[PDB]
Enzyme design. Structure first.
Site, PDB file in Angstrom:
ATOM      1  N   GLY A 192       9.230  -5.862  -2.678  1.00 30.71           N
ATOM      2  CA  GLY A 192       9.286  -5.915  -4.128  1.00 30.71           C
ATOM      3  C   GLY A 192       8.126  -5.191  -4.780  1.00 30.71           C
ATOM      4  CB  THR A 193       4.462  -5.485  -4.560  1.00 31.68           C
ATOM      5  OG1 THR A 193       4.267  -5.630  -3.151  1.00 31.68           O
ATOM      6  CG2 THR A 193       4.480  -6.844  -5.221  1.00 31.68           C
ATOM      7  CD  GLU A 201       2.047  29.871  -2.391  1.00 38.17           C
ATOM      8  OE1 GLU A 201       1.116  29.161  -1.973  1.00 38.17           O
ATOM      9  OE2 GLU A 201       2.077  31.113  -2.245  1.00 38.17           O
ATOM     10  CB  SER A 208       7.157   0.061   2.188  1.00 38.69           C
ATOM     11  OG  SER A 208       6.847  -1.128   1.488  1.00 38.69           O
ATOM     12  CB  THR A 216      10.446  -6.395   8.353  1.00 42.61           C
ATOM     13  OG1 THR A 216      10.294  -5.557   9.503  1.00 42.61           O
ATOM     14  CG2 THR A 216       9.114  -7.070   8.078  1.00 42.61           C
ATOM     15  CD  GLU A 265      -0.631 -12.591  -2.153  1.00 37.91           C
ATOM     16  OE1 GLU A 265       0.383 -12.847  -2.835  1.00 37.91           O
ATOM     17  OE2 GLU A 265      -1.564 -13.408  -1.993  1.00 37.91           O
ATOM     18  CG  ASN A 290      -0.253   2.415   9.784  1.00 34.04           C
ATOM     19  OD1 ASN A 290       0.968   2.508   9.784  1.00 34.04           O
ATOM     20  ND2 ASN A 290      -0.876   1.274   9.557  1.00 34.04           N
ATOM     21  CD  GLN A 341       0.084  -5.188   4.355  1.00 36.25           C
ATOM     22  OE1 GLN A 341      -0.851  -4.399   4.436  1.00 36.25           O
ATOM     23  NE2 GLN A 341      -0.064  -6.493   4.518  1.00 36.25           N
TER      24      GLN A 341
HETATM   25  N1  LIG Z   1       2.718   1.234   8.179  1.00 33.98           N
HETATM   26  C1  LIG Z   1       3.014  -0.046   8.004  1.00 33.98           C
HETATM   27  N2  LIG Z   1       4.174  -0.425   7.350  1.00 33.98           N
HETATM   28  C2  LIG Z   1       4.468  -1.735   7.172  1.00 33.98           C
HETATM   29  C3  LIG Z   1       3.592  -2.685   7.654  1.00 33.98           C
HETATM   30  N3  LIG Z   1       4.079  -3.904   7.374  1.00 33.98           N
HETATM   31  C4  LIG Z   1       5.240  -3.757   6.726  1.00 33.98           C
HETATM   32  N4  LIG Z   1       5.510  -2.428   6.593  1.00 33.98           N
HETATM   33  C5  LIG Z   1       6.723  -1.928   5.924  1.00 33.98           C
HETATM   34  O1  LIG Z   1       6.953  -2.728   4.780  1.00 33.98           O
HETATM   35  C6  LIG Z   1       8.218  -3.358   4.774  1.00 33.98           C
HETATM   36  C7  LIG Z   1       8.066  -4.826   4.400  1.00 33.98           C
HETATM   37  O2  LIG Z   1       7.888  -5.017   3.016  1.00 33.98           O
HETATM   38  P1  LIG Z   1       6.467  -4.735   2.326  1.00 33.98           P
HETATM   39  O3  LIG Z   1       6.324  -3.277   1.993  1.00 33.98           O
HETATM   40  O4  LIG Z   1       5.382  -5.196   3.266  1.00 33.98           O
HETATM   41  O5  LIG Z   1       6.419  -5.619   0.992  1.00 33.98           O
HETATM   42  P2  LIG Z   1       5.425  -5.217  -0.203  1.00 33.98           P
HETATM   43  O6  LIG Z   1       5.713  -3.835  -0.716  1.00 33.98           O
HETATM   44  O7  LIG Z   1       3.982  -5.317   0.207  1.00 33.98           O
HETATM   45  O8  LIG Z   1       5.766  -6.304  -1.333  1.00 33.98           O
HETATM   46  P3  LIG Z   1       5.472  -7.862  -1.085  1.00 33.98           P
HETATM   47  O9  LIG Z   1       6.493  -8.431  -0.135  1.00 33.98           O
HETATM   48  O10 LIG Z   1       5.603  -8.562  -2.409  1.00 33.98           O
HETATM   49  O11 LIG Z   1       4.077  -8.065  -0.553  1.00 33.98           O
HETATM   50  C8  LIG Z   1       8.744  -3.246   6.187  1.00 33.98           C
HETATM   51  O12 LIG Z   1      10.112  -2.919   6.180  1.00 33.98           O
HETATM   52  C9  LIG Z   1       7.918  -2.152   6.835  1.00 33.98           C
HETATM   53  O13 LIG Z   1       8.682  -0.974   6.935  1.00 33.98           O
HETATM   54  C10 LIG Z   1       2.435  -2.311   8.301  1.00 33.98           C
HETATM   55  O14 LIG Z   1       1.681  -3.184   8.717  1.00 33.98           O
HETATM   56  N5  LIG Z   1       2.136  -0.985   8.477  1.00 33.98           N
HETATM   57  N1  LIG Z   2      -0.638  43.423   6.796  1.00 31.77           N
HETATM   58  C1  LIG Z   2      -0.796  42.209   6.231  1.00 31.77           C
HETATM   59  N2  LIG Z   2       0.296  41.599   5.723  1.00 31.77           N
HETATM   60  C2  LIG Z   2       0.197  40.391   5.145  1.00 31.77           C
HETATM   61  C3  LIG Z   2      -1.115  39.756   5.085  1.00 31.77           C
HETATM   62  N3  LIG Z   2      -0.941  38.581   4.472  1.00 31.77           N
HETATM   63  C4  LIG Z   2       0.372  38.472   4.167  1.00 31.77           C
HETATM   64  N4  LIG Z   2       1.050  39.550   4.573  1.00 31.77           N
HETATM   65  C5  LIG Z   2       2.499  39.764   4.400  1.00 31.77           C
HETATM   66  O1  LIG Z   2       2.900  39.539   3.049  1.00 31.77           O
HETATM   67  C6  LIG Z   2       4.222  38.999   3.054  1.00 31.77           C
HETATM   68  C7  LIG Z   2       4.467  38.086   1.869  1.00 31.77           C
HETATM   69  O2  LIG Z   2       3.285  37.974   1.088  1.00 31.77           O
HETATM   70  P1  LIG Z   2       3.423  37.168  -0.287  1.00 31.77           P
HETATM   71  O3  LIG Z   2       3.500  35.687  -0.029  1.00 31.77           O
HETATM   72  O4  LIG Z   2       4.657  37.663  -0.974  1.00 31.77           O
HETATM   73  O5  LIG Z   2       2.143  37.499  -1.183  1.00 31.77           O
HETATM   74  P2  LIG Z   2       2.257  37.240  -2.757  1.00 31.77           P
HETATM   75  O6  LIG Z   2       3.032  38.370  -3.360  1.00 31.77           O
HETATM   76  O7  LIG Z   2       0.882  37.183  -3.357  1.00 31.77           O
HETATM   77  O8  LIG Z   2       2.968  35.946  -3.027  1.00 31.77           O
HETATM   78  C8  LIG Z   2       4.359  38.229   4.351  1.00 31.77           C
HETATM   79  O9  LIG Z   2       5.634  38.490   4.935  1.00 31.77           O
HETATM   80  C9  LIG Z   2       3.257  38.756   5.241  1.00 31.77           C
HETATM   81  O10 LIG Z   2       3.832  39.413   6.367  1.00 31.77           O
HETATM   82  C10 LIG Z   2      -2.259  40.485   5.656  1.00 31.77           C
HETATM   83  O11 LIG Z   2      -3.400  39.983   5.630  1.00 31.77           O
HETATM   84  N5  LIG Z   2      -2.028  41.681   6.199  1.00 31.77           N
HETATM   85 MG   LIG Z   3       1.709  -7.724   0.031  1.00 31.23          MG
END
Ligand SMILES: Nc1nc2c(ncn2[C@@H]2O[C@H](COP(=O)(O)OP(=O)(O)OP(=O)(O)O)[C@@H](O)[C@H]2O)c(=O)[nH]1
Ligand SMILES: Nc1nc2c(ncn2[C@@H]2O[C@H](COP(=O)(O)OP(=O)(O)O)[C@@H](O)[C@H]2O)c(=O)[nH]1
Ligand SMILES: [Mg+2]
Ligand SMILES: Nc1nc2c(ncn2[C@@H]2O[C@H](COP(=O)(O)OP(=O)(O)O)[C@@H](O)[C@H]2O)c(=O)[nH]1
Lengths: 427, 136, 438, 426
Positions: free
Chosen positions: C143-144, C253, C139, C178, C70, C227, C10
């Protein structure tokens, strides 16, 4: 080929120092994008004291921008001449300083002194033969006075023989923003009585008086005040970028003002600061500048020069002026005023004359004077320190970053020596 | 400026346009008049093109013709220097980046669009002159 | 490139119905089974090849086998809305469910239909030139969903052999019954799942019941939502064969990249961006948080939490609009994270991949329009602790020897009952022997 | 005159190699119809090195296209330039390598090395006077170490003396992809060191920092790392196609850098990499192109060269430059860093120049370094192996393709054989 690097720290220093680069750049003809569009070939001839070529015929400045909050740097690039700067040199933090000296030096900017220096140490290699630096800050806040103090001991342990320069706002007695300004300033003079080789004192309180009486502005915003410091801070580097007829570079002044190794807190000035209504009514010659140069309400430090004694005066003139006429006016304002100049220094004035004026002024000048009046700034700071300290008012945030109760008194006696070392040489 | 990639996607997600295409290269030494399908995704304006093959021709069964890509308009554009294809410009690096107020290194790279594709007109697929001959 | 999909009981048929609407909607194909005349979806050349084979008249037909003892569910899908699609002989009914009985779902009726289902599997395999692996839906509690699962995969493995099988399955939940005979209907298929599975992905009910209670705005839910969710995850897994991206990994990275030993292959899945449409657009669904909230115990799909057991291998497959620096930063964050402990015989532990097709949601649905998606596939050791429950559910109901009287009448006897129990004892003993650090 | 074969395998190698031929075909100026539409006349006079003539003028490439799955090569022809490759060169199986050494090298491996060697030796005869082999792959996967490690082992035993290029994307230390990485490495490290005698090998992790700071990219994809390692493999092969002043070919780039026969594992570079907006703020002279090359951070390295020494460095310049200012700028870089270059070798630096700058720049350079600090990459893989091998993790898939545990711990004995040799020169 005698280069200087600009460092500008904080929220006051960056606002001041972003106005300085708008003064200089149109002195040398260059556009708000570094393009040269000038109309004099001598504008380029020594541009490499402060600049640095960029490809295509665009010049960039040599500046390093410092903050602990990132909101100011947007406010500088949004400025008029903001876009010329170096974008790799903008350096800043995340969180706040808390307006703590204990957080710029110890927490918030101490995790940044690797990266400010690597921009800095790069800028001192692009040069041909380095001479100087210049920090731009105040002495009331966390960022300006707690990072701009750590950075100096970062440079001098590296570059111990290059001549450092330092431009600094001293906190006013009655003009107040923090309640914790004496705590910020007194722990910051501990590293400028040692490490700077040139330091300046500018008061916001006396800056207001010039804008009320001499300039006669109705309501001055900061933009005119930050402009006022720009034309004196660009006065000490005049003999490096333009030909002179009796010229003195950034080094020649320093050995000649300072008589003993801790007396280097100078007062600025600017002679032809005139009201807009009285420009049409004014004669402009070499005598009448001097009656405005030494004039006690046209100088940017709130301690009266008539309440002390001068030690040495420089005056960096600009224009085309006669050289007898310069050197007899610096005699005449010594003979008619004999008391306020010290004994055991026979000629109490240094002089200097350049050849390229400011923009639009046919002739100008710039005062720098070392008086014994500066102890008054160093007494109202020191009394407000012990006013709060004798019951430990706001300390458990600075104690949060863990300075004990001796390091505020160890750096209190280093602040009262300037009370001693000026009355040592007054009588 | 808009770097947003959402409203167009929400409006035009699953709408893709399709035009049957012909490329008439018999002027080469061994060339054929070829039949293709051009897809066009309205979500992001990217063109994917497929391959449609006759009954017993000799061609290989490879996946496509070209990948999903924003097809450039005139010819093959030149391969630009690295770091220049950013979408958003940056002031400094305090990894965390602070954005810039001005767009300095931004480039004027034109693309095909749904109003540049029409029935009865000729276009350029990386140099291949094709004519869109039909629609659904 | 092809893969064979089977739906049993869900729950598997129901979740598969969900998968099939999602694949038909994912490609261009109608419930009339034909690609449409007018609308062009911009589909691939031949990119439906993984799940669909194309008859020459244009009717495309699926590859999936729907089996239920479900007939109620299949006889309603034969009359429902998908009467036209399927091959009429593809669908297998009967006239009696498990009524929660492993033995009635496996032996009394079980022999009657296996030739039908195997012949249908060969009938599928002969047309596809490519082949990669098996995709099986069930989540255990019915169960699912258990007995028919075991029966079909044992017969399919003795037919084919060397190819991977991936069981996408629903597993029971405690305190709900819940059915009454769940352990007696569950433990019996476990012997053959361990004998031959490679990727047994368990999914629970009440975990998804609660995740749709709280992530979505659902009160009183039913099955269809569950959400369709599971269908989305399965398409997210499978997308690397269909679409092409920058980093992509196929199924061998990640088979060679997630499985350490041949008897430990039980990973666990999770899909991250699952949320309602009102709340969705009021948040950014970014990649970092999408893969961080992918690691929560309440976001998993089986109630055994990851905190008790240590991980061993993870893969993260991405789709949509992803750039690799994003995911590398995400790995680095997870590796620096504290609570998530690995096992000391993987240094590396991950894997990544990137693809360029976004998620796609069925109309009349439950999910939001999202531009990205990921899906992780990881294995930990807590599923042994998810099996000790059914061990001690079986024991106290076997201590009276209760209701094996229905089991003894059908094919199986009492002898398998002890073998399944000693098999599960060996399996949980081997998880402990693996999970010990050496 | 001297023509070269390039071989594409793996997811990672095929992809980078697609981005390789786009950086070649635009610099010589032929468009994806195969017609020639270049600009200068210096692009035709040595067009034969990588490419090959055809009737009507459709220039075809010389490459062989191997992958065990068809996913990637149905995405390489789907590119813009992908319709040039000869479709008798596309060879494939049908399943992926699973990220596995087992499904690459032996078992599914024999089912295409018959078929991928039969198109390679069709290219050798159509070639006039061959030089060597190129190969593009990744060590950590199933097509790269699976197909390539075969193909290099089965093409030196046909051509016994030719130079061998190998471009291996190594696995990343802490950010990688697959769990199977210590398997694809240690198995393929054995046949590389015995055979392939120059690997140009740095990973994906170090390419992500160059994207994040130097280029200040926000979202770097994989389409830009390839463009980052396609340029440095098209500037190492530039004195075979373009004129210059002091130019050096692929045997000149071996005898300078193989002191002892099993020490040839290099490390690449590419000089004028800047930001996007900051082009207009920067000066370009060889006093500062020599500064982007010679650091540990803004050069392509998932290792610290400050944790070891430099054994022999080469650096290939391009563009219209001086030769004192090049040669004095290699004098000033060994004196200031003498602690980091070895003793017992008087000159460390080879230098070559050329007279063609690339598309869009006035000068460029490629910094290629052989260093003693590469042994940490070969350390961390052999540390990942031993904590994973001894419980016998994935040894049934390798058993699932006929490979024994007798040749796993034998390959661990040669990673540890090789880590001792680079460490000999403390
Ligand atoms: N973001 C969000 N999370 C929810 C919502 N409803 C439930 N949850 C999370 O889901 C948990 C409840 O169990 P579910 O994940 O819904 O159960 P399920 O995975 O769908 O499995 P079933 O019970 O068989 O349907 C809760 O502890 C919540 O954290 C919702 O409407 N939105
Ligand atoms: N002068 C300058 N420095 C840069 C630029 N882009 C990245 N750097 C420097 O490059 C450093 C590390 O680069 P890095 O991730 O090692 O490049 P890679 O070797 O290809 O992985 C960083 O600390 C930045 O300060 C740029 O456009 N100009
Ligand atoms: Mg469900
Ligand atoms: N001349 C000038 N002074 C300023 C400006 N902005 C702020 N200030 C002064 O800066 C002082 C405090 O700055 P500070 O505390 O050092 O800023 P902080 O460093 O961010 O904490 C105030 O007393 C202001 O008078 C400006 O734009 N120009």
């Amino acid at each position: 080929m005698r280069e200087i690097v600009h460092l500008q720290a904080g929220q006051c220093g960056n606002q001041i120092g972003a106005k300085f680069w708008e003064v200089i750049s149109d002195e040398h003809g260059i556009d708000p994008t570094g393009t040269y569009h000038g109309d004099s070939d001598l504008q380029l001839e020594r541009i490499n004291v402060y600049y640095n070529e960029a490809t295509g015929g665009k010049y960039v400045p040599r500046a390093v921008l410092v903050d602990l909050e990132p909101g100011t740097m947007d406010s500088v690039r949004s400025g008029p001449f903001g876009q010329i700067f170096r974008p790799d040199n903008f350096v800043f933090g995340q969180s706040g300083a808390g307006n703590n000296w204990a957080k710029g030096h110890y927490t918030e900017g101490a995790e940044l002194v690797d990266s400010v220096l690597d921009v800095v140490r790069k800028e001192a290699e692009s040069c041909d033969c380095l001479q100087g630096f210049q920090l731009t800050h105040s002495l009331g806040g966390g960022t300006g006075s707690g990072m701009g103090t750590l950075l100096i001991s970062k440079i001098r342990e590296e570059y111990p023989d290059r001549i450092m320069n330092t431009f600094s706002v001293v906190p006013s007695p009655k003009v107040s923003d923090t309640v914790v300004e004496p705590y910020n300033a007194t722990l910051s003079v501990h590293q400028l009585v040692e490490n700077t080789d040139e330091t300046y004192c500018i008061d916001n309180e006396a800056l207001y008086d010039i804008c009320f009486r001499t300039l006669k502005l109705t309501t001055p915003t900061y933009g005119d005040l930050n402009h006022l410091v720009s034309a004196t801070m660009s006065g000490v580097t005049t003999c490096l970028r333009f030909p002179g007829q009796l010229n003195a570079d950034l080094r020649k002044l320093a050995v000649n003002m300072v008589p003993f190794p801790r007396l280097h807190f100078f007062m600025p000035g600017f002679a032809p600061l005139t009201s807009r209504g009285s420009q049409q009514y004014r004669a402009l010659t070499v005598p009448e500048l001097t009656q405005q140069m030494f004039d006690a309400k046209n100088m940017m430090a709130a301690c009266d020069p008539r309440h002390g004694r001068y030690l040495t005066v420089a005056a960096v003139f600009r224009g085309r002026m006669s050289m007898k006429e310069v050197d007899e006016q610096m005699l005449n304002v010594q003979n008619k005023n004999s008391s306020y100049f010290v004994e055991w220094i026979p000629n109490n004035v240094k002089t200097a004359v350049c050849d390229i004026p400011p923009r639009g002024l046919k002739m100008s000048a710039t005062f720098i004077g070392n008086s014994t009046a500066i102890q008054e700034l160093f007494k109202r700071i020191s009394e407000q320190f012990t006013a709060m300290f004798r019951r430990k008012a706001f300390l458990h945030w600075y104690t949060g970053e863990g300075m004990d109760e001796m390091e505020f008194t160890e750096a209190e006696s280093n602040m009262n020596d300037l009370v001693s070392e000026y009355q040592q040489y007054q009588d | 400026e808009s770097f947003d990639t959402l409203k167009q996607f929400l409006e035009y997600d699953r709408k893709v346009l399709r035009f049957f295409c012909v490329w008439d290269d018999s002027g080469s030494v061994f060339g054929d008049r070829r039949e293709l399908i051009l897809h066009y995704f309205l979500s992001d304006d990217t063109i994917e093109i497929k391959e449609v093959l006759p009954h017993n021709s000799g061609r290989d069964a490879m996946s496509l013709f070209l990948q999903r890509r924003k097809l450039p308009k005139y010819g093959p554009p030149g391969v630009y220097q690295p770091g220049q294809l950013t979408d958003q410009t940056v002031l400094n690096v305090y990894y965390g980046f602070l954005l810039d107020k001005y767009q300095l290194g931004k480039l004027d790279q034109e693309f095909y669009k749904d109003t540049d594709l029409s029935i009865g007109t000729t276009i350029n697929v990386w140099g291949r002159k094709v004519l869109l001959c039909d629609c659904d | 490139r092809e893969c064979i999909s089977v739906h049993v009981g869900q729950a598997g048929v129901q979740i598969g119905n969900a998968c099939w609407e999602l694949y038909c909607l994912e490609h261009g194909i109608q419930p009339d089974g034909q690609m449409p005349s007018d609308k062009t979806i911009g589909g691939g050349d031949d990119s439906f090849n993984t799940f669909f084979s194309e008859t020459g008249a244009g009717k495309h037909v699926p590859r999936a086998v729907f089996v239920d003892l479900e007939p109620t569910v299949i006889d309603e899908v034969r009359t429902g809305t998908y009467r036209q699609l399927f091959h009429p002989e593809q669908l297998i009914t009967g006239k009696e469910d498990a009524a929660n009985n492993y033995a009635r779902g496996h032996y009394t009726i079980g022999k009657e239909l296996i030739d039908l289902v195997l012949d249908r599997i060969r009938k599928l395999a002969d047309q596809c030139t490519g082949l990669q692996g098996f995709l099986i839906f069930h989540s255990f509690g019915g169960g699912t969903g258990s007995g028919f699962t075991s029966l079909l995969m044992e017969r399919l493995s003795v037919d084919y052999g060397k190819k991977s099988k991936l069981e996408f399955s629903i597993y029971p939940a405690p305190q709900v019954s819940t059915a009454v005979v769940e352990p007696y209907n569950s433990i019996l298929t476990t012997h053959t799942t361990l004998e031959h599975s490679d990727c047994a992905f368990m999914v629970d009910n009440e975990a998804i019941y609660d995740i749709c209670r709280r992530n979505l705005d659902i009160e009183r839910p039913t099955y269809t939502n569950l959400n369709r969710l599971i269908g989305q995850i399965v398409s997210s897994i499978t997308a690397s064969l269909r679409f092409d991206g920058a980093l992509n990994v196929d199924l061998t990275e990640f088979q060679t990249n997630l499985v350490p030993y041949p008897r430990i292959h039980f990973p666990l899945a999770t899909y991250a961006p699952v949320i309602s449409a009102e709340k969705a657009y009021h948040e950014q669904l970014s990649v970092a948080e999408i893969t961080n909230a992918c690691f929560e115990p309440a976001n998993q799909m089986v109630k055994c939490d990851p905190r008790h057991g240590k991980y061993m291998a993870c893969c993260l497959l991405y789709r949509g609009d992803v750039v690799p620096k994003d995911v590398n930063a995400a790995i680095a964050t997870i590796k620096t994270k504290r609570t998530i402990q690995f096992v000391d015989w993987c240094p590396t532990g991950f894997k990544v991949g990137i693809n360029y097709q976004p998620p796609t949601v069925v109309p009349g649905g439950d999910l939001a329009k999202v531009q990205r998606a990921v899906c992780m596939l990881s294995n930990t050791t807590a599923i042994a602790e998810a099996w000790a429950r059914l061990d001690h559910k079986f024991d106290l109901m076997y201590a009276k020897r209760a209701f094996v009287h229905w089991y003894v009448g059908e094919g199986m006897e009492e002898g398998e009952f002890s073998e399944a129990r000693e098999d599960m004892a060996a399996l949980e003993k081997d998880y402990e022997e693996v999970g010990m650090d050496s």
